[PDB]
């Protein structure tokens, strides 16, 4: 019964950037590409969505790792999975 729009997904992804103490509110909004300050190998590829593992966290399969480098490419196909915006 509750609908959703696309202005909420832009904030929550952006908020958990600020919720992490490793990342300042001085990085770019949609595309810092993770490598800008992403480190190192492990724990900068799966830990970066380990906060959304609790929040959104619909089991997030093995393909979701290397697509998630582009931080806008995360925002792309969450709308495809959960039957979202128009």
């Amino acid at each position: 019964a509750p609908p959703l729009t696309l202005e909420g997904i832009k904030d929550r992804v952006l908020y958990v950037l600020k919720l992490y103490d490793k990342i300042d509110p001085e990085k770019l909004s949609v595309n810092s590409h993770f490598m800008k300050d992403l480190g190192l190998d492990s724990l900068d590829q799966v830990e970066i969505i380990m906060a959304m593992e609790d929040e959104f966290g619909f089991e997030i399969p093995d393909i979701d790792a290397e697509k998630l480098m582009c931080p806008q490419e995360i925002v792309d196909y969450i709308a495809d999975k959960k039957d979202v915006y128009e």
């Binding site: 190192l40 190998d41 492990s42 724990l43 590829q45 799966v46 380990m50 593992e53 609790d54 966290g57 619909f58 089991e59 997030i60 093995d62 790792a65 959960k82 039957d83």
Partner: protein, 167 residues
């Protein structure tokens, strides 16, 4: 499955099976870097058996004590109410035979139906022409060129392009 992402698929579940074992919220969170501390022991070294003993002894203490009926994220391969939306199930393109006075309803949806089929009915002069060229003989996975060099139409058209929405 490369050795680079061999630990990573084990790293996602090492914390995931842990949170089904806690009772508080901070009990998991106080153990966060504590679980990371054993994982941060071998940081940067070789790729041989020198470092495979991180993994060759990770069978014990991970499979030993592995998730006594863990959390399952109910919309998943397993878990309850995962594939449940099936009484509707969206039978797309069941609209062939009607014997109308049943095609009276939705006059605009049936108007828009015949419009989209031109991409479906006419793309084989273009998409199948390069499909014998872009695929050399029998190569691996059959995605096309991702714009198809002028207009990707689609190749997956339209069964993956207009597929079933969930509700």
């Amino acid at each position: 499955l490369t050795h680079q992402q061999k630990v990573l698929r084990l790293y996602k579940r090492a914390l995931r099976h842990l949170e089904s074992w806690c009772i508080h919220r901070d009990k998991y969170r106080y153990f966060a870097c504590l679980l990371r501390a054993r994982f941060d022991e071998h940081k940067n070294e070789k790729d041989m058996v020198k470092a495979t003993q991180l993994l060759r002894e990770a069978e014990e203490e991970f499979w030993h004590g592995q998730h006594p009926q863990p959390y399952i994220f109910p919309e998943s391969p397993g878990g309850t109410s995962y594939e449940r939306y099936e009484c509707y199930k969206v039978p797309e393109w069941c609209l062939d035979d009607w014997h109308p006075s049943e095609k009276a309803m939705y006059p605009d949806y049936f108007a828009k139906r015949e419009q989209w089929k031109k991409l479906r009915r006419e793309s084989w002069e273009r998409e199948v022409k390069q499909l014998q060229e872009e695929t050399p003989v029998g190569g691996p996975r059959t995605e096309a060129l991702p714009p198809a060099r002028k207009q990707g139409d689609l190749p997956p058209l339209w069964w993956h392009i207009v597929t079933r929405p969930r509700e």
